Amino acid sequence: KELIEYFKSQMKEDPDMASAVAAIRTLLEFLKRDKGETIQGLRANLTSAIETLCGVDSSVAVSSGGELFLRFISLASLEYSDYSKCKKIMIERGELFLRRISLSRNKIADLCHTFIKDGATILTHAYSRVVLRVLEAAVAAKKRFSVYVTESQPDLSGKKMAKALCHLNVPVTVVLDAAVGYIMEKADLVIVGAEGVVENGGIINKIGTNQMAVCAKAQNKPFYVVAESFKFVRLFPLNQQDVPDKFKYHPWVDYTAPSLITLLFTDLGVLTPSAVSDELIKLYL
Amino acid sequence: KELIEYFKSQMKEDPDMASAVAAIRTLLEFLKRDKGETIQGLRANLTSAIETLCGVDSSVAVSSGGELFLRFISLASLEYSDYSKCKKIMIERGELFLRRISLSRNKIADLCHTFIKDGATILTHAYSRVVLRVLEAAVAAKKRFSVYVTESQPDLSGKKMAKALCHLNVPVTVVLDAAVGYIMEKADLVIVGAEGVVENGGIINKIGTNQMAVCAKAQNKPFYVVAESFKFVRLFPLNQQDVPDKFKYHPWVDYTAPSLITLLFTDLGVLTPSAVSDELIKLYL
Amino acid sequence: GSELSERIESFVETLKRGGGPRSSEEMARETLGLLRQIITDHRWSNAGELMELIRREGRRMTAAQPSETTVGNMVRRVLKIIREEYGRLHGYAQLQSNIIEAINELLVELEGTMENIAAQALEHIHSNEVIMTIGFSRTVEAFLKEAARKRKFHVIVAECAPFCQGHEMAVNLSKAGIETTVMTDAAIFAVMSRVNKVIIGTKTILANGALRAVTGTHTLALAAKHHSTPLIVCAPMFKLSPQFPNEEDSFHKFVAPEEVLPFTEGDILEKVSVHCPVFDYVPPELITLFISNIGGNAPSYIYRLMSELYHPDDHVL
């Protein structure tokens, strides 16, 4: 399996690199290495590629990025009638789309860090590069604030987030993961990074998020959720079992109601949670 | 310091024994060993005893039991004018009060386990003998239910609770402490053991409780709190810092709003949370 | 020429000194007339040069008064109209008359806004109804004074403490006979137990569905959310702004504290700190429905009107 080897080579060469962009690069490399002049023959190969990428990596962003890439392949196949020019069209359009995606995080940082007040308190969850990029743009914009990061028990990455913030020389504190309701009254805003956004406006994240969301609901705190556009999922989980069980495995994913979410911070801008369904219905899976 | 030595000898000889009853036994032994014919001379000695018991043990139930014992000493001093008969009156009344207190847990079990349905799901917090006594009376009353116990990260005692329930041969599962909002929709009732009850109806417990309480509020689940009568505290914490800081030391105590609590299960019976203030105002500290 | 800069500076210090004119639809007509005078009195080869020009004078006009967003969003709407015409002509010399006729279409759209809200006003009022409003706005009083032509109901106009402008709304609605009740601003939750729905106006709709309005209406929105009564925001589409709430803390407009605490209070005015914010912030979760001239919209739909009327490249202006 050269696809999983190329995916692990793209994901392990950079620790600042997400899993979804590595999966999209692996899918583009597999489409460039396919050279099969068939629409359904390429669609079945892409579906087996996303099957391998979901059997290997249990992340939601990998399958999300593969579904967006499959919708992009379907749009490029429905646009051009002949396949010979359509192969080069898919290659150039996918390379330009990956170039647009690789600059997305900086766009989130300059368009997101404007909201954070000076002299305030930030409550944040486990390790991701997006909230570090937003916070380093905030401290590059000459802002001072106190940071409380969840320890995030199943893999101690919030302590790694705190180490990365102490190397940034900012006041950060590892707070107990059973104490997100203890420090909610002092946290005037709760900004969190997500790994997958479902259609109605809710999010798919790490297990300690949703309870914090209802701590943001009873205590009236603005629960800000930060995520890019390739994490948009065409699913509707109703209850906590209604997420797909292959992404769970002690649960690993909690569904957060869209009423508990104040704003989203995507590449389209600062959006209401109802905007994700707009993008997902003009995208049509 | 013979008082702390007697307290540790009473608390370490029985693992089924609480800290508050050991503190009341230590206070009764110190009152029997005082032999000082003075009202204020005994009150200052008792206050220094509770000062030592609060400097040694940072539990809220120890200081609560000492304040109830001090109010009992004040009532017995205000009742009898002469101190010579009042010393034996205090000794006999304290021995009879300790005999009444030592049978309290069984009373909680037979008067509390009636509420738990058959074929239901229990959500429970960290290790205490009271919820084990209630659950063993429930399985002695021929009831079957599935138990989800919080792992309770700062001292892994919920796993010890689960081991004590697997030795009882009941279906119990260690659930992630960041997943108390994940399994709230399947938990039709949430029964929890507390270590201290403040005056309005709220409780003082271990740090992972209060967030679960608001998970019981947004998801309409009946949040049952189980505690005896010697855990009644004459305090009013408004915010999470308004608890006394000597009982905190990563926080260890969360204050739970009385609106998030459905019922209490004390030695007076199944009570509304407004009953604790009634008992605390006819007790008068 | 020179007369253009005369009129521009007169508009700038008119916005700087006070409210000139009084209501907002005349101000939007003045802004569109000033913008058509700017595009008819200049010379350009590319549309981007006029775009940079309009961005500079929009920066100047919003630096005159940062609290009033109508001039800024009108400049941004004219910028998106120019961008749409350049995009539809790019895929050259006929651009200027196209922007002129587009500004004329926007003027015909803008003059018939309040009467379109009045035409769709009958779809929200039933017989023997208790209505509570705040402040003073000619859209809401026109709404109620023509909705009382076929229905009979009750309007409770609550005054606002900095400038009791609801007395004018009360004496304007009482001439139409809608059984107007006049109250203070402190009895809202005292009367929220009987108010069936809340029909208010606003000053500026934000990008996330939130709104700034006359002060004390966030309390009214909280009480109406507590009592679960629907909120009707009768607002036009020139009060729609892409400015986010948390942006350089320039939200509230503070005025002189004489109307709160007079100058004849004594020597105690030295050791006191009196603030008078005339505007207030309402989040979109405390709002049920917006009523614009094109119909009723959700607070979960303000982003679509934002992307349909404004461009994300012009948010900095």
Side-chain angles (χ1 to χ4, degrees), chain A residues 6-8 10 14-30 36 41 43-44 46 49-50 53 55 58-69 71-72 74-76 80 83 90 93-94 96-98 100-106 108-128 130-141 143 145-168 171-285, chain B residues 6-8 10 14-30 36 41 43-44 46 49-50 53 55 58-69 71-72 74-76 80 83 90 93-94 96-98 100-106 108-128 130-141 143 145-168 171-285, chain C residues 1-245 250-317:
Chain A
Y6 185 76
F7 176 71
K8 279 182 190 132
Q10 285 292 325
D14 197 12
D16 196 16
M17 200 173 180
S19 357
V21 295
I24 295 174
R25 283 186 67 95
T26 303
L27 280 161
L28 194 64
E29 196 66 46
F30 183 71
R43 279 184 175 181
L46 282 183
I50 294 169
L53 283 178
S58 74
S59 179
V60 175
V62 171
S63 82
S64 220
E67 193 95 302
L68 299 175
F69 188 77
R71 188 51 174 94
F72 190 75
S74 353
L75 277 156
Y80 297 94
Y83 197 77
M90 284 178 186
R93 272 179 183 178
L96 175 122
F97 172 71
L98 270 164
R100 276 290 301 264
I101 286 300
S102 302
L103 56 80
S104 64
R105 205 188 301 274
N106 292 338
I108 303 278
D110 58 26
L111 101 66
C112 170
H113 85 289
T114 304
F115 277 77
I116 291 95
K117 301 284 102 176
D118 197 40
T121 299
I122 294 294
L123 176 51
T124 221
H125 211 52
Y127 176 73
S128 61
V130 197
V131 175
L132 294 174
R133 181 74 58 89
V134 164
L135 282 192
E136 77 182 9
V139 308
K143 295 180 184 180
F145 42 84
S146 66
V147 187
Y148 289 133
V149 58
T150 305
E151 55 169 13
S152 291
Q153 195 41 64
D155 42 350
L156 279 74
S157 67
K159 292 181 181 179
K160 192 182 61 184
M161 164 84 79
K163 285 174 185 303
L165 214 49
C166 297
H167 190 273
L168 194 136
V172 67
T173 301
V174 176
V175 64
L176 213 47
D177 82 350
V180 302
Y182 180 80
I183 60 157
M184 185 52 72
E185 49 174 38
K186 75 185 65 178
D188 46 352
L189 75 160
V190 182
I191 170 169
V192 69
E195 59 185 4
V197 183
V198 298
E199 194 170 354
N200 56 345
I203 48 161
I204 285 176
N205 213 8
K206 195 175 173 65
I207 191 65
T209 307
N210 174 42
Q211 43 165 0
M212 179 188 302
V214 314
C215 297
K217 186 49 74 185
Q219 303 200 11
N220 276 299
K221 300 310 191 314
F223 189 72
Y224 301 109
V225 176
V226 175
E228 288 88 2
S229 352
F230 48 84
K231 301 179 179 181
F232 290 163
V233 202
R234 273 296 309 263
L235 292 174
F236 209 93
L238 277 74
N239 304 328
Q240 300 299 313
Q241 292 87 16
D242 216 282
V243 291
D245 213 344
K246 57 181 177 297
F247 300 117
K248 287 181 174 182
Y249 303 96
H250 304 274
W252 273 93
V253 175
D254 52 1
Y255 157 84
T256 299
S259 61
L260 322 169
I261 295 177
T262 299
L263 282 165
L264 268 298
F265 295 86
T266 78
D267 290 330
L268 299 92
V270 187
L271 299 173
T272 310
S274 45
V276 184
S277 45
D278 198 355
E279 305 307 311
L280 281 178
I281 66 176
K282 43 194 213 203
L283 205 61
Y284 284 117
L285 295 176
Chain B
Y6 185 76
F7 176 71
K8 279 182 190 132
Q10 285 292 324
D14 197 13
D16 196 16
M17 200 173 180
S19 357
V21 295
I24 295 174
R25 283 186 67 95
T26 303
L27 280 161
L28 193 64
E29 196 66 46
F30 184 71
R43 278 184 175 181
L46 282 183
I50 294 169
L53 283 178
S58 74
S59 179
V60 175
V62 171
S63 82
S64 220
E67 193 95 302
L68 299 175
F69 188 77
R71 188 51 174 94
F72 190 75
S74 353
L75 277 156
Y80 297 94
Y83 197 77
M90 284 179 186
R93 271 180 183 178
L96 175 122
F97 172 71
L98 270 164
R100 276 290 301 264
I101 286 300
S102 302
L103 56 80
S104 64
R105 205 188 301 274
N106 292 339
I108 303 278
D110 58 26
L111 101 66
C112 170
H113 85 289
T114 304
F115 277 77
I116 291 95
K117 301 284 102 176
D118 197 40
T121 299
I122 294 294
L123 176 51
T124 221
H125 211 52
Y127 176 73
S128 61
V130 197
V131 175
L132 294 174
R133 181 74 58 89
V134 164
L135 282 192
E136 77 182 9
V139 308
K143 295 180 184 180
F145 42 84
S146 66
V147 187
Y148 289 133
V149 58
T150 305
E151 56 169 13
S152 291
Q153 195 41 64
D155 42 350
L156 279 74
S157 67
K159 292 181 181 179
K160 192 182 61 184
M161 164 84 79
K163 286 174 185 303
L165 214 49
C166 297
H167 190 273
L168 195 136
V172 67
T173 301
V174 176
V175 64
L176 213 46
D177 82 349
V180 302
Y182 180 80
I183 60 157
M184 185 52 72
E185 49 174 38
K186 75 185 65 178
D188 46 352
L189 75 160
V190 182
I191 170 169
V192 69
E195 59 185 4
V197 183
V198 298
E199 194 170 354
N200 56 345
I203 48 161
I204 285 176
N205 213 8
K206 195 175 174 65
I207 191 65
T209 307
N210 174 42
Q211 43 164 1
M212 179 188 302
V214 314
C215 297
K217 186 48 75 185
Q219 303 200 11
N220 276 299
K221 300 310 191 314
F223 189 72
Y224 301 109
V225 176
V226 175
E228 288 87 2
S229 352
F230 48 84
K231 301 179 179 181
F232 290 163
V233 202
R234 273 296 309 263
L235 292 174
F236 209 93
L238 277 74
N239 304 328
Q240 300 299 313
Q241 292 87 16
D242 216 282
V243 291
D245 213 344
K246 57 181 177 297
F247 300 117
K248 287 181 174 182
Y249 303 96
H250 304 274
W252 273 93
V253 175
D254 52 1
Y255 157 84
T256 299
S259 61
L260 322 169
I261 295 177
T262 299
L263 282 165
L264 268 298
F265 295 86
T266 78
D267 290 330
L268 299 92
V270 187
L271 299 173
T272 310
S274 45
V276 184
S277 45
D278 198 355
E279 305 307 311
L280 281 178
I281 66 176
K282 43 194 213 203
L283 205 61
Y284 284 117
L285 295 176
Chain C
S2 178
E3 182 68 27
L4 176 139
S5 296
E6 294 288 329
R7 200 169 184 269
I8 280 176
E9 277 289 340
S10 177
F11 194 76
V12 158
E13 273 94 30
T14 299
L15 263 67
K16 271 177 177 177
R17 285 160 190 173
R22 268 81 194 182
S23 73
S24 60
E25 179 177 75
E26 185 44 82
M27 187 165 265
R29 285 187 282 104
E30 285 183 355
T31 309
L32 291 166
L34 184 64
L35 279 157
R36 84 168 65 175
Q37 202 178 350
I38 285 167
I39 70 170
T40 47
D41 292 32
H42 282 88
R43 179 60 64 172
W44 67 96
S45 178
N46 200 12
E49 186 186 1
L50 197 147
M51 273 171 184
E52 291 293 329
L53 184 144
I54 288 302
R55 272 176 188 267
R56 186 182 288 109
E57 282 106 18
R59 277 168 188 266
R60 285 185 70 252
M61 282 183 292
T62 68
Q65 185 68 251
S67 174
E68 198 169 11
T69 70
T70 307
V71 189
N73 60 59
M74 267 304 112
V75 165
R76 202 168 290 111
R77 268 219 61 181
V78 164
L79 274 169
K80 195 186 180 182
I81 281 173
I82 289 155
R83 187 179 282 105
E84 282 170 339
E85 288 286 331
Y86 182 72
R88 80 175 66 248
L89 283 178
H90 180 73
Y92 207 89
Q94 61 265 0
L95 170 68
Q96 183 185 358
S97 182
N98 283 319
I99 303 303
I100 283 298
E101 62 90 19
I103 283 176
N104 289 320
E105 282 174 30
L106 195 54
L107 271 185
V108 310
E109 177 175 330
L110 192 144
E111 174 207 319
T113 296
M114 298 182 179
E115 83 161 34
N116 277 322
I117 300 174
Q120 69 169 296
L122 208 59
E123 295 175 0
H124 299 287
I125 289 298
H126 62 85
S127 297
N128 306 135
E129 200 173 11
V130 186
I131 316 285
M132 175 147 65
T133 174
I134 197 70
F136 169 71
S137 44
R138 288 176 169 82
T139 308
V140 183
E141 77 177 357
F143 194 105
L144 296 162
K145 85 174 54 185
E146 68 93 32
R149 293 174 186 268
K150 293 185 178 58
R151 312 290 176 83
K152 289 303 176 185
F153 54 96
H154 304 79
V155 174
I156 321 179
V157 181
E159 58 173 14
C160 314
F163 282 103
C164 305
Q165 221 180 359
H167 295 175
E168 319 175 18
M169 191 180 186
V171 302
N172 281 321
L173 290 191
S174 179
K175 282 171 181 178
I178 330 171
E179 205 72 25
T180 304
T181 308
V182 187
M183 55 175 279
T184 54
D185 197 19
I188 291 176
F189 195 71
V191 305
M192 209 56 229
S193 177
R194 315 277 173 271
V195 166
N196 312 127
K197 64 167 52 163
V198 172
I199 305 184
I200 54 173
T202 189
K203 182 66 177 185
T204 284
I205 308 182
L206 309 173
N208 67 99
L211 57 96
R212 88 185 64 173
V214 307
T215 184
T217 194
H218 175 76
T219 290
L220 171 56
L222 282 168
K225 183 64 179 184
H226 186 256
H227 281 268
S228 295
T229 81
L231 284 88
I232 303 301
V233 187
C234 298
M237 297 189 88
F238 55 86
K239 298 181 178 181
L240 185 62
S241 182
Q243 292 307 110
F244 296 116
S250 164
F251 198 89
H252 295 260
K253 193 181 80 177
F254 290 84
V255 299
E258 172 75 30
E259 290 87 16
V260 175
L261 202 44
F263 200 68
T264 67
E265 191 65 37
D267 46 350
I268 82 170
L269 284 171
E270 186 189 9
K271 300 298 292 299
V272 78
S273 179
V274 186
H275 295 93
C276 186
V278 290
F279 293 114
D280 209 356
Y281 168 75
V282 182
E285 67 256 16
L286 312 180
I287 298 295
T288 310
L289 186 68
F290 289 88
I291 298 299
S292 313
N293 51 342
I294 62 174
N297 291 317
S300 76
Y301 199 56
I302 311 296
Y303 75 101
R304 193 51 196 173
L305 316 172
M306 185 61 56
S307 60
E308 275 168 355
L309 296 185
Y310 300 95
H311 208 262
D313 191 274
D314 310 331
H315 286 184
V316 296
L317 186 54

Coordinates of all heavy atoms in Angstrom, one line a residue, chain A residues 38-81, unseen atoms left out:
Chain A
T38 N -11.0 6.9 -17.4 CA -12.4 6.4 -17.0 C -12.9 7.3 -15.9 O -12.2 7.6 -15.0 CB -12.4 4.9 -16.6
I39 N -14.2 7.7 -16.0 CA -14.8 8.5 -14.9 C -15.1 7.6 -13.7 O -14.7 7.9 -12.6 CB -16.1 9.2 -15.5
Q40 N -15.9 6.5 -13.9 CA -16.2 5.6 -12.8 C -15.0 4.8 -12.4 O -14.9 4.4 -11.2 CB -17.3 4.6 -13.3
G41 N -14.1 4.5 -13.3 CA -12.8 3.8 -12.9 C -11.9 4.7 -12.0
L42 N -12.0 6.0 -12.2 CA -11.3 6.9 -11.3 C -12.1 7.1 -10.0 O -11.5 7.2 -8.9 CB -11.0 8.2 -11.9
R43 N -13.4 7.1 -10.1 CA -14.2 7.3 -8.9 C -14.1 6.1 -7.9 O -14.1 6.3 -6.7 CB -15.7 7.5 -9.3 CG -16.0 9.0 -9.7 CD -17.5 9.2 -10.0 NE -17.8 10.6 -10.3 CZ -19.0 11.0 -10.5
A44 N -14.1 4.9 -8.5 CA -14.0 3.7 -7.6 C -12.6 3.6 -7.0 O -12.4 3.2 -5.9 CB -14.3 2.4 -8.4
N45 N -11.6 4.1 -7.8 CA -10.2 4.1 -7.2 C -10.1 5.1 -6.1 O -9.4 4.9 -5.1 CB -9.2 4.4 -8.4
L46 N -10.7 6.3 -6.3 CA -10.7 7.3 -5.2 C -11.5 6.8 -4.0 O -11.1 7.1 -2.9 CB -11.3 8.6 -5.8 CG -10.4 9.5 -6.7 CD1 -11.1 10.8 -7.0 CD2 -9.1 9.8 -6.0
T47 N -12.6 6.1 -4.2 CA -13.3 5.6 -3.1 C -12.6 4.5 -2.3 O -12.6 4.5 -1.1 CB -14.7 5.1 -3.6
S48 N -11.9 3.7 -3.0 CA -11.0 2.7 -2.4 C -9.8 3.4 -1.7 O -9.4 2.9 -0.6 CB -10.5 1.7 -3.4
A49 N -9.4 4.5 -2.2 CA -8.3 5.3 -1.6 C -8.8 5.9 -0.3 O -8.1 5.9 0.7 CB -7.8 6.4 -2.5
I50 N -10.0 6.4 -0.3 CA -10.6 7.0 1.0 C -11.0 5.9 1.9 O -10.9 6.1 3.2 CB -11.8 7.9 0.6 CG1 -11.3 9.1 -0.3 CG2 -12.5 8.4 1.8 CD1 -12.4 9.8 -0.9
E51 N -11.3 4.7 1.4 CA -11.5 3.6 2.3 C -10.2 3.1 3.0 O -10.3 2.9 4.2 CB -12.1 2.4 1.5
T52 N -9.1 3.1 2.3 CA -7.8 2.9 2.9 C -7.4 4.0 3.9 O -6.9 3.7 5.0 CB -6.7 2.7 1.9
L53 N -7.7 5.2 3.5 CA -7.3 6.4 4.4 C -8.2 6.4 5.7 O -7.8 7.0 6.7 CB -7.4 7.7 3.7 CG -6.2 8.0 2.7 CD1 -6.4 9.3 2.0 CD2 -4.9 8.0 3.5
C54 N -9.4 5.8 5.6 CA -10.3 5.8 6.8 C -10.0 4.5 7.6 O -10.3 4.5 8.8 CB -11.7 5.9 6.4
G55 N -9.6 3.4 7.0 CA -9.2 2.3 7.7 C -7.8 2.5 8.5 O -7.6 1.9 9.5
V56 N -6.9 3.3 7.9 CA -5.7 3.6 8.5 C -5.8 4.7 9.6 O -5.6 4.4 10.8 CB -4.6 4.0 7.5
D57 N -6.3 5.8 9.2 CA -6.5 7.0 10.1 C -8.0 7.1 10.4 O -8.8 7.1 9.6 CB -6.0 8.3 9.5
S58 N -8.2 7.1 11.7 CA -9.6 7.2 12.2 C -10.1 8.7 12.5 O -11.0 8.9 13.2 CB -9.8 6.4 13.5 OG -9.1 7.1 14.6
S59 N -9.4 9.6 11.8 CA -9.7 11.0 12.0 C -10.9 11.3 11.1 O -11.1 10.7 10.0 CB -8.5 11.9 11.6 OG -8.9 13.3 11.7
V60 N -11.7 12.3 11.5 CA -12.9 12.8 10.8 C -12.5 13.7 9.7 O -13.1 13.7 8.6 CB -13.9 13.4 11.8 CG1 -15.1 14.0 11.1 CG2 -14.3 12.4 12.8
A61 N -11.4 14.4 9.8 CA -10.9 15.4 8.8 C -10.4 14.7 7.6 O -10.5 15.3 6.5 CB -9.9 16.3 9.4
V62 N -9.9 13.5 7.7 CA -9.4 12.8 6.6 C -10.5 12.4 5.7 O -10.5 12.6 4.4 CB -8.6 11.5 7.1 CG1 -8.2 10.6 5.9 CG2 -7.3 12.0 7.8
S63 N -11.6 11.8 6.2 CA -12.7 11.4 5.4 C -13.5 12.6 4.9 O -14.1 12.6 3.8 CB -13.7 10.5 6.2 OG -14.5 11.2 7.1
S64 N -13.5 13.7 5.7 CA -14.1 15.0 5.2 C -13.4 15.5 4.0 O -14.0 15.9 3.0 CB -14.1 16.0 6.4 OG -15.4 16.7 6.4
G65 N -12.0 15.6 4.1 CA -11.3 16.1 3.0 C -11.4 15.2 1.8 O -11.4 15.7 0.6
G66 N -11.4 13.9 2.0 CA -11.7 13.0 0.8 C -13.0 13.2 0.2 O -13.2 13.0 -1.0
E67 N -14.1 13.5 1.0 CA -15.4 13.7 0.4 C -15.5 15.0 -0.4 O -16.1 15.1 -1.4 CB -16.5 13.6 1.4 CG -17.9 13.5 0.8 CD -18.4 12.0 0.6 OE1 -17.6 11.3 -0.1 OE2 -19.4 11.7 1.1
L68 N -14.8 16.1 0.2 CA -14.7 17.3 -0.6 C -14.0 17.1 -1.9 O -14.3 17.7 -2.9 CB -14.1 18.4 0.3 CG -15.1 18.6 1.5 CD1 -14.5 19.6 2.5 CD2 -16.5 19.0 1.2
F69 N -12.9 16.4 -1.8 CA -12.1 16.1 -3.0 C -12.9 15.3 -4.0 O -12.7 15.5 -5.2 CB -10.8 15.4 -2.6 CG -9.8 15.2 -3.7 CD1 -9.0 16.3 -4.1 CD2 -9.6 14.0 -4.3 CE1 -8.1 16.2 -5.2 CE2 -8.8 13.9 -5.4 CZ -8.0 14.9 -5.8
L70 N -13.7 14.3 -3.5 CA -14.5 13.5 -4.4 C -15.6 14.4 -5.0 O -16.0 14.2 -6.2 CB -15.2 12.4 -3.6
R71 N -16.2 15.4 -4.3 CA -17.1 16.3 -4.9 C -16.5 17.2 -5.9 O -17.1 17.5 -6.9 CB -17.8 17.1 -3.8 CG -19.0 18.0 -4.3 CD -20.0 17.1 -5.1 NE -21.2 17.8 -5.5 CZ -21.3 18.5 -6.6
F72 N -15.2 17.6 -5.6 CA -14.5 18.4 -6.6 C -14.2 17.6 -7.9 O -14.3 18.1 -9.0 CB -13.2 18.9 -6.0 CG -12.5 19.9 -6.8 CD1 -12.9 21.2 -6.8 CD2 -11.3 19.6 -7.5 CE1 -12.3 22.1 -7.5 CE2 -10.7 20.5 -8.2 CZ -11.1 21.8 -8.2
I73 N -13.9 16.3 -7.7 CA -13.7 15.4 -8.9 C -15.0 15.2 -9.6 O -15.0 15.2 -10.9 CB -13.1 14.1 -8.4
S74 N -16.1 15.1 -8.9 CA -17.4 15.0 -9.6 C -17.8 16.3 -10.3 O -18.3 16.2 -11.4 CB -18.5 14.6 -8.6 OG -17.9 14.3 -7.3
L75 N -17.5 17.4 -9.7 CA -17.8 18.7 -10.4 C -16.9 18.9 -11.7 O -17.4 19.3 -12.7 CB -17.6 19.9 -9.5 CG -18.7 20.2 -8.5 CD1 -18.2 21.0 -7.3 CD2 -19.7 21.1 -9.3
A76 N -15.6 18.5 -11.6 CA -14.7 18.6 -12.7 C -15.0 17.6 -13.8 O -14.7 17.8 -15.0 CB -13.3 18.5 -12.3
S77 N -15.6 16.4 -13.4 CA -16.0 15.5 -14.4 C -17.3 15.9 -15.1 O -17.5 15.6 -16.3 CB -16.2 14.1 -13.8
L78 N -18.2 16.5 -14.3 CA -19.5 17.0 -14.9 C -19.3 18.3 -15.8 O -20.1 18.5 -16.6 CB -20.5 17.3 -13.8
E79 N -18.2 19.0 -15.5 CA -18.0 20.3 -16.3 C -17.4 19.9 -17.7 O -18.0 20.3 -18.7 CB -17.0 21.2 -15.5
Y80 N -16.3 19.2 -17.7 CA -15.7 18.9 -19.0 C -16.2 17.5 -19.5 O -16.3 16.5 -18.8 CB -14.2 18.8 -18.8 CG -13.5 20.1 -18.4 CD1 -13.3 20.4 -17.1 CD2 -13.2 21.1 -19.3 CE1 -12.8 21.6 -16.7 CE2 -12.6 22.3 -19.0 CZ -12.4 22.5 -17.6
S81 N -16.5 17.5 -20.8 CA -17.1 16.3 -21.4 C -16.0 15.3 -21.7 O -16.1 14.1 -21.3 CB -17.8 16.6 -22.7

